[PDB]
Structures are given as C-alpha cells and as structure tokens.
C-alpha cells in the first residue's frame, strides 16, 4: 500500500558503505574512520580532521523549500563526558548547513541537538538532555535510536528510542536551503579524546508518524541477536559484569564455590565520579560471567536469541559452572558455582532470550533447563533470611525485572577503572 520515503539509506553492503536509496548518492570516506570488526554498520568518528564521512546529495534531493516535510533517523553511541572542557561546548556532528541555512545535528554535554535555520537567520532547536548524575543511565555510552521529524506547518520533533522527547514550533521559518552535502564529522569539539559511534543513517521525504518510528526502532534493533549493556552484540567467550534490573544497586558475588556455596546479590555498588561532571554507580563489580557454547552450530561467537548455552563464573581467574540440583525442595532452585569436571548431571543448560519492550534496551533472560530439556525456570533471585540468593524459578515463567539481566563488558566510553 506503500511508497519508499527513504531518500538516503546509508548501509554497509557488499564490502562498502553505500546509499541503498534509488538516488545512490556518493559517499566519500575519510582515512581515519573505524568500523567495528563484528558489525560493519557501526562507524566510529574521532576528533580528527580525517575522521569523516561526506555524502554528496543528488540535486533532486537537496533541501531547498518553504514547505517540504522531512525526517532523519540514526543510531548513536556517545561516550561519557569526563572533563569540564566539555561543559558549554556545542559541537556539530552531522552538518547540512550552507551559508547559515539548513539543518544539523550537534552534541553538547548531556545533549543531542537538532537545529534548523532559514535563509533569513530564523532558527529553531529541539533538544534531548540526559543526566550524568544518575545511578544507571539508559543513554550514557549506550546505543540510542534518534529520530527527528519536521512538519513545516507546525512542529519539529525529536524521538529517542521511539518515544517523543521534545517538540518545538517551526512554522515561522521561511525558505530553508540546506547544503549539497552531508558532513559526518566532529566539528568544534574541544575534547581531543572525544569520539562517537554511529549507524544506519537515513533521510526521509516526509514527517514520519509514531507508528513508522516504532517500526523503524523495532526493525533496526536486530532482536534476533542478543545485546550487551552498551547495545553491541552479545558474545560467547567474553567476560561480562552482571546487572540485575530489579536490584540495580547490587552486584553478583559468590559465597564459596561448590554445591554448598551459592551465588548472591549484594550492595551497594559504590560510585564513580568527577566533580560537577558525572556521578554514577560503579559497573565493574562482582564475579564476571562468561557465556559458553553448547547447542549452537553457528561458527561465529555471537549469541543469538534462543541459543542454549552454559554460563561460567570467573572466581580468582578460574572458570566455574553455574548450576543447581533441581531436586532441592521448593520452587526456587539456588544456583552455585561448580568445578566444571564435577557438574555431573546437575542442571546447567540455559536458554538465552532477548527481551525487547518499551523500557531500557538490551535486556536478557536466562531460562535454566534440566538435562531432558524441561524448564527449571528463569534465573533471578530470592530473599532467603536476608540473603538475596540467585535462583532459577518457574514462578517467573508463569508471569518481571527480577529475571532481567544485562551483561557489561569493559568499554572505554565508560572510563571506570576496575578495582582489580
């Protein structure tokens, strides 16, 4: 029933970053652009002149109008601001301004900004602002879906993860004559170590509606592959610190290895800080988990939705197996960290599931099964005489955030120094 409204669809395909739209606009990649080795649609731009991508627009789609509606969408991952040199330093990242008219995306401390300017210097801005004084952020250093829409008779709107954040009137702007090119480059950034990650840039020749935006968000989320906390693909054989979303100020520890010990949650996490710049919960706490292949026949190390795996727990630089004896009384089966040669017939197979909904991105569930494939239940926790022990429980399966987890690898955009 439809029309392709995407007039620029920038994707990595067949070994190159290209425009997939009918216009096939030309792409000039600079010499210091980094691509993620696992997902080549993920592009890293540094604070360097050669870290840039320029799109040469076909003339038919250069914006020069008093009336035409248009939108843009992309994903971005912005490292934590670390130093006061980033306060009050708006810097352009996606530039389609020519002679002070056009559009641009810029960033500032805790901000993503869209600016429109007409040929008579009338401007409007729409702004997403996120805090760095917050225990756990949905936004700092995590993949964010941005969508900006513009209706020349009323409002410009910015959406984040499919949700409307800010809307401002633009009907007083006259002719907007944008650039013949789009420059993806950090422009005016005083922090020499600043960078961004970006992916899936699109332009559209209409004002996208809410349904269209949510569909783009769901589609581009790649729900077939599980994600880590930052929004990158979850991997096998990669150590992760654990976050339980129900109890986000607690971390995972072990009270003795073996079948008479147990895994548990304890807190508080403690804080990471730079005065006036950030104050957040420490993320590099507790015993690391490593996801191990069991049933998957894919020969990459990406964790897919519904993969059956084992979970190893790292204690003193040695791996143990997360397991339980499902015969123990009561619905909740307490998890222990076992010597791998000693697991025997104990329950240890975990079904990994992505959980995509309207809350924080990148949630994962872990359904423990016995050796006949019967569900023992989702991994969460249960308070036993004031100790929050990790359990597998079919109580979750009949119905929450107690059984929702995120996997946090060390990342330079977070900047925390592990204690050990």
Author numbering: 872 to 1270, 1277 to 1297
The authors write:
Botulinum neurotoxins are the causative agents of botulism, a lethal paralytic disease, but are also one of the most commonly used therapeutics for the treatment of numerous neuromuscular conditions. These toxins recognise motor nerve terminals with high specificity and affinity by using a dual binding mechanism involving gangliosides and protein receptors. Three HCA mutants, Y1117V, H1253K, and Y1117V/H1253K were characterised using ganglioside-binding assays and X-ray crystallography.
The same is true for H1253 with one exception: mutant HCA H1253K displayed a 1.5-fold increase in binding. This single point mutation seems to favour recognition of gangliosides lacking the terminal Neu5Ac and the interaction with the Gal4, thereby changing the carbohydrate preference. It should also be noted that the structure of a H1253K:GD1a complex could not be obtained despite crystallisation experiments carried out in similar conditions confirming the decreased EC50 of HCA H1253K for GD1a. The high-resolution crystal structures of the HCA mutants in complex with the polysaccharides of GD1a for Y1117V and Y1117V/H1253K, as well as GM1a for H1253K were determined. Single mutation of H1253 to lysine affected the ganglioside selectivity of BoNT/A by presenting a significantly higher affinity for the non-sialylated Gal4 epitope of GM1a and GD1b compared to the wild-type and Y1117V mutants. Additionally, the crystal structure of the H1253K:GM1a complex shows that the long K1253 side chain can reach the centre of the carbohydrate portion of the ganglioside via hydrogen bonds with the central GalNAc3 moiety. These results suggest that successful variation in ligand selectivity may be achieved by targeting this sub-site of the pocket, by engineering additional favourable electrostatic interactions with the GalNAc3 moiety. In the case of the single H1253K mutant, Y1117 seems to impair GD1a’s Neu5Ac5 access to the binding pocket.
